[PDB]
Amino acid sequence: RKIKLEGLSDVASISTKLQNTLIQYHSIKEDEWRVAKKVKDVTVWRKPSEEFNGYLYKAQGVMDDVVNNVIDHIRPGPWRLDWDRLMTSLDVLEHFEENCCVMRYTTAGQLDNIISPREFVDFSYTVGYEEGLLSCGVSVEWSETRPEFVRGYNHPCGWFCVPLKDSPSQSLLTGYIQTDLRGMIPQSAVDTAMASTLANFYSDLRKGLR
Question: E strands within 42-151?
Fold first, then answer.
């Protein structure tokens, strides 16, 4: 049922479904998660994806900054490209509303180029969640833009960012990532690179926020 954003109703349908989906992921109990990587500043879990032959990842860690500045740096635009070492380019393709867009980005090779570069075209939506924000996304069709690499597929994904309990100048950041790199890659390489991607996200974002 792959996604074309041809009208207002398409953007409304996909936005609300993404929100409900990410919220459901956020309610998945700890028993369903297996630890993929654990260090002092971040934990990364995985579980089998219901969308494709691969994993849904979860990550959780604290950022020494408030929700608005964290989510500003994660959302599609030049700031995200600034700190995210995995990204080699990023172009927002169309502005739907202040909180809603379609973008393309390309990734560097991973695991000393075992995993070749990819590009993605993703719908992106930011909406209020509890005391914080949710910023979520999914790959969509967009044939107007000149491709450079084989397109990967981002199944529903996103970032929950809320004030840290008892300490509002800090934020609890929870991510869900469900990327299909596609092409032919040893699954062991894929799983290593994905767990690494989520861990590096946090350490890169920490530096980027300064």
Answer: 43-48, 55-63, 87-97, 100-107, 119-129, 132-139
Phi, psi of 18 (to 5 degrees): -60, -45
CA distance 64 to 67: 10
Q: Is 196 exposed, middle or buried (0-12, 13-18, 19+ CB in 10 A)?
A: middle
How, if at all, do strands 132-139 and 157-164 pair? Answer: antiparallel
What ranges do the domains of the chain cover? 1-210
Tell me how many degrees the CA angle 195-200-206 measures, rounded to the nearest 5.
140
Give the side-chain half-sphere CA count within 13 A for 190: 18
Joined together, the tokens standing for residue 28 give: 């998945």
- The residues near 50 (Cβ < 8 Å, ≥ 6 apart) are 56
DSSP assignments along 150-180, one per residue: -B-EE-SEEEEEEEETTEEEEEEEEEEE-EE
CA distances in angstroms from 13 to 5, 20, 74, 177, 200, listed in the order given: 10, 11, 23, 21, 32
CB 170 within 8 A of CB 30: no
CATH of domain 1-210: 3.30.530.20
